[model samples]
Target chain A: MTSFEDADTEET
Target chain B: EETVTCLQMTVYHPGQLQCGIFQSISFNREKLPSSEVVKFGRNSNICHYTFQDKQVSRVQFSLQLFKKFNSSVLSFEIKNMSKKTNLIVDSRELGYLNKMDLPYRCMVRFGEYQFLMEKEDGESLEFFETQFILSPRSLLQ
Candidate 1:
């Protein structure tokens, strides 16, 4: 994943 | 049971799933033995997601593989569904793309979700994860 943030975007 | 859909899908994790291919291994990569560290996550929203590129191949085919961790009843596995193709693959192939020098683009689509559950595989479950494996690769006009 590019950013851990983007991965989190899928959920919370 | 596994969870996947909506091509540019993110917030995707194994989340205790039992049958999904990707979800099964997401957690395993961490413990894999390798010269280098393996990394894995939802690369992007495009259908037919594969591990044929630099980073992906390194983890999948070379030294290590991604790991999956799910606490729910859903099966643990990776789910691959191409918006453009009928073939479905998980934890296989895509390793070839890792050696390619050509640029690749991730699949994307429109989607919206709101839920009381903290994750994709759990109902009203708290504490979820997000994965942004996709990077910007554009299509030629």
Candidate 2:
């Protein structure tokens, strides 16, 4: 259950 | 052609689809409180439609824009949280469409389920939708 809260922190 | 092949394939099992194409783009994500459904994304375009009769530990889905595939062809994916497997449905064959078809509809089937992608028309003009549908199997039984 990884949250994308930091999804935008780094670009993949 | 590799991109197309990667996207299309006949359903083999519940978690066997491997959608591997398209460019990375920003999207919204949300966790459904009902314990069976979760919706996420800035525009709330990603939806995890779960079946109550068939519950999984976790279900993840993603969408990306693939300019090369079509007029910003949106790439999609689904992953089984516990099994950690990718699923692929229908065909991934590369095809071209008129750019004017910006607000177009694309449907792919995985087993008895259908994944639909379409551009949203309105103020949130830039946003698109990634939704799923499950067909009743009771008729076959």
Candidate 3:
């Protein structure tokens, strides 16, 4: 499931 | 009790249902026998007439006629709601380039980001305006 906790962050 | 209400409500619409992410289940007016599940498929067809050996839609002919003798045209900018990006397209370019049989001195630029078209002397051509919606940082995040 996708979570909004990482909504605004981009993967490194 | 909730299932009964939901089933009753579903049979009240015109047989429309949506199932996907961020989508809610809907009920239609077409009544069916009491069942726990229903499955169906929808088919749609869209067609256009052929002109000068080219298949063209109704709006395509209208826009072509409008840009043929007009001095300006309306454009559009489609922005992605999730991604921070947008695509700008000139509506005039769709039909304008197809009818370029007339001999004239002209300069034109065409793409998804920017589009420009004009005659050498700048006469009898549609000039489009830049209409883009501004994105907000707070709203984006």
lDDT of 2 by residue, B65-138 (tens): 33435433343332222232222322442122101212244543323334444433222213334333222222
Q: Rate the local accuracy (lDDT) of all candidates.
A: 0.24, 0.28, 0.20
B38-106 per-residue lDDT for model 3 (tens digits): 221111121111111111111121112122345342211111121222211322232332433211212
Give the i-RMS of model 2 in Å: 11.4
Candidate 3's displacement at residue A9, Å, is: 13
lDDT of 2 at B140: 22
- Report clashes for each candidate as comma-separated counts: 51, 18, 8
Provide per-model DockQ scores.
0.03, 0.04, 0.01
In terms of docking quality, model 2 is: incorrect
Per-prediction TM-score: 0.16, 0.29, 0.14
Order the candidates by DockQ, highest first — what do you get?
A: 2, 1, 3
- Ordered list by TM-score, greatest first: 2, 1, 3
Model 3 interface root-mean-square deviation: 18.3
DockQ of 2: 0.04
Q: Rank the candidates by lDDT, best first.
A: 2, 1, 3
Q: What's the CA error at residue B99 for candidate 2, in Å?
A: 22
Model 2, runs deviating above 4 Å: A1-12, B1-48, B53-57, B64-86, B93-103, B125-141
10 residues in a row with least lDDT, candidate 2 chain B: B1-10
Best-fitting candidate, scored by DockQ? 2
